Design a protein around this ligand. Structure first.
Ligand SMILES: [Fe+3]
Ligand SMILES: [Fe+3]
Ligand SMILES: [Fe+3]
Ligand SMILES: [Fe+3]
Ligand SMILES: [Fe+3]
Ligand SMILES: [Fe+3]
Ligand SMILES: [Fe+3]
Ligand SMILES: [Fe+3]
Ligand SMILES: [Fe+3]
Ligand SMILES: [Fe+3]
Ligand SMILES: [Fe+3]
Ligand SMILES: [Fe+3]
Ligand SMILES: [Fe+3]
Ligand SMILES: [Fe+3]
Ligand SMILES: [Fe+3]
Ligand SMILES: [Fe+3]
Ligand SMILES: [Fe+3]
Ligand SMILES: [Fe+3]
Ligand SMILES: [Fe+3]
Ligand SMILES: [Fe+3]
Ligand SMILES: [Fe+3]
Ligand SMILES: [Fe+3]
Ligand SMILES: [Fe+3]
Ligand SMILES: [Fe+3]
Lengths: 169, 169, 169, 169, 169, 169
């Protein structure tokens, strides 16, 4: 029952993505309140940072503990340019989340090729949260194309944060 | 991360099946009480109509909202012949439910061929409810081969309706 | 006390209307969230779909069970064109609801001509829900002529859905 | 929708494994308290016996009831040699549990080759409990390499038994 | 106070009987629902399987722990033929239960011949459950000679399962 | 009331330290359970990771929001060598925590030199948590010099984690 080295590497790379994304999203959350004057958009993005630098990363380490796989910590992230407005900050988050979806799909395809059924099971969480976290992000992006008032958008975000689907929750 | 057109079509066809089945099952529920004098068999079939014209159909539209897929509404259903007895009405429901199982299997096979792992996840609900809803139907069919009294059968159906397995519930 | 064949036909046609309307309204609810970015307008229209494909249809079948009338299921519905904006989607719903009012009036007139007093009683529910469901729809249509912000309108719809008159409730 | 004979056989063989393992684990639990003077290690192994001779076996029979598959009961188990110490008794349990993992993987691979998506769904429970039950076992094995006192180990086992992960629980 | 080798052997043989009976009764419970369409008769027989493969077996191992006796695990059971109907399945269970009574009597006679008063005490539980478990079984057998309807019998079994005498409970 | 650029830089460097420390401590927590077989030592170090990558980092960004200071995200961390035992893993954490104390002292000295009294106030939290978090770490280090049993140490850590001083809490 020996562990696939290719999955270890793909999952160590997913650990990295999640760590680094959450570190950018912590900055973007700072920028959303500070520069863009939108406190609740930052709360939304802070909650994403904490999801990524949290359960998304810890589930990988736990799996590794159980399967014999090794953890690798190599992190390199710099926020050197910030988007111009808040619409674009949330659109950037989206872009990154759609990319998470593409990476997760690759781990699933590999698990099936390596006949690792425990890794395919493990990734099913990530297959689902991929669409979910993007759906959440899209719903905020939508708002910026539905109002020209930042204060109306901000109140809609409030309620969204101050709120589980049977398939995707 | 662009959507498979073949899955959209298979899932738009599953939406249609569920809409149309529930419309037949609403008729069959009417017929079970009206013509066949079995009120609780109709309650069982009304509950199936409502499952199909409900969650089975709405989960598809929600997925579509999230993935970029399009909804299509083309419905054509007519109940032109009704079964002769109640045993046969429930046996007809069974037949249709075993066919749901075969259709769902095809969506799963395609998702794996198209490498759509989010659609394979989505269909896992339907893989499971396929067997479940058939199991429920079979359990009523069984009754008609275990009694010659419609009133005993009816009381067994009562209790069954007036009632979640860890794998299939 | 033998049943009027003309009322059976008018009520079998009303069953059809309600089934088919609810199937269009389920699509329109999908479109209101998906394309038009208005989640709560779709919840409003989903609630209408469920009313029509529910109590409006089931009360007819129950009556039929009691009076000797026959149910007919012949459904043909296709959504081939969708309105351009959300104002027009709700204005289309209105149009269809004002037409329900005209059809219900015809069943009432016929019942009185056929001296079916039980059908006139039965239709009194529909006489009342006709104006009610239109009033509800008009109240949403009004909003689109009172704001240019989709997000303000959406919050007014929220509260309206997240809410019985002594004559019309 | 006709049942795969190869899955029936693989699942009838898994039924056998679980029955026979639980019968050995009931003996090993006896031996852990009686000969090895470790009451709580036996409680841990008695709880495994009961899991195997319980839900692991009953879920297979239930599935069979639903899919048309046949149950086969052919059991042959003898405990003819017992390990020398308790470290080795738990290490033997581990070995057997890692083998369960390998067998479950084979059922999954076959289900995908036979295009049995309901069997792949069914086995997902077993894919998960495979790693879980091994993780539990490893955690006890670990203790024997962390203390030379059987009474300290025994108290750690106590607390472990006298205690659900979102992916593996 | 040294242990009788003859009682150890008789009680190791009783352990075997109980293990093997419960494994047949688990099959028969499967067959009662699956083939014979009687879900509650199988629940009754599943409850017997669990009694035998449970307390009947564990009390022997516990005694052994206390008296110095050895446990032996040698199990060989195959279900190669199933009864034709449900009356006969329950009549087969009866036969096997009346045989339990005869075996238990022999352990008691031996204990008194070996002057093992602690084994005579221990067996008093089994002397009592022998008649009890047979009484329960007879009460179900009776039903099959009192109705020709499987659905009436099934409802009587339901209530019996969904239910302690001062001497036999 | 214009912000000191030197404090911004020192506090942006403290943000970096805390992010990077928590990422190493997440690895070390993995290693403490996985390799060193000490689950509760890892829980202790996971709790430190979360403190650092949490409140220690967020309080800096909040301050920045209020004072006009800029956030900088430049992270570079790699775990390339792991300590040999668990005593040394906790001794490494200590070393790093005593270094936090030295860095915090420097921010305080600078604030007083720059006459930034709001930054001196802000740092008072960090002056205090410096000694506290080290005290906590020392208390675990102590254990490894007080027992040779990893399982006794582990139970002492359990209780410590499963547990506010008026000056340092
Ligand atoms: Fe604020
Ligand atoms: Fe979340
Ligand atoms: Fe393959
Ligand atoms: Fe997430
Ligand atoms: Fe009725
Ligand atoms: Fe249901
Ligand atoms: Fe492929
Ligand atoms: Fe269903
Ligand atoms: Fe939504
Ligand atoms: Fe309503
Ligand atoms: Fe008149
Ligand atoms: Fe209505
Ligand atoms: Fe004891
Ligand atoms: Fe368990
Ligand atoms: Fe294939
Ligand atoms: Fe298990
Ligand atoms: Fe059942
Ligand atoms: Fe009992
Ligand atoms: Fe004597
Ligand atoms: Fe018993
Ligand atoms: Fe653990
Ligand atoms: Fe803390
Ligand atoms: Fe000064
Ligand atoms: Fe701290």
């Amino acid at each position: 029952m020996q562990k696939s080295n290719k999955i270890n590497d793909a999952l160590n790379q997913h650990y990295k993505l999640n760590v680094e994304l959450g570190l950018v999203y912590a900055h973007y959350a700072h920028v959303a309140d500070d520069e863009f004057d939108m406190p609740y958009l930052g709360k939304f993005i802070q909650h994403l940072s904490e999801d990524k630098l949290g359960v998304h990363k810890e589930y990988i380490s736990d799996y590794f503990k159980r399967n014999g796989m090794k953890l690798k910590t190599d992190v390199s992230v710099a926020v050197k340019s910030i988007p111009s407005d808040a619409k674009a900050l949330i659109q950037e988050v989206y872009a990154r989340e759609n990319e998470v979806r593409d990476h997760v799909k690759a781990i699933a395809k590999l698990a099936l090729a390596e006949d690792d059924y425990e890794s395919f099971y493990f990734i099913q969480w990530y297959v689902r949260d991929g669409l979910k976290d993007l759906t959440e992000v899209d719903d905020v992006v939508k708002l910026f194309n539905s109002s020209n008032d930042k204060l109306i958008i901000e109140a809609t975000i409030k309620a969204m944060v101050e709120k589980e689907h049977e398939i995707w929750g």
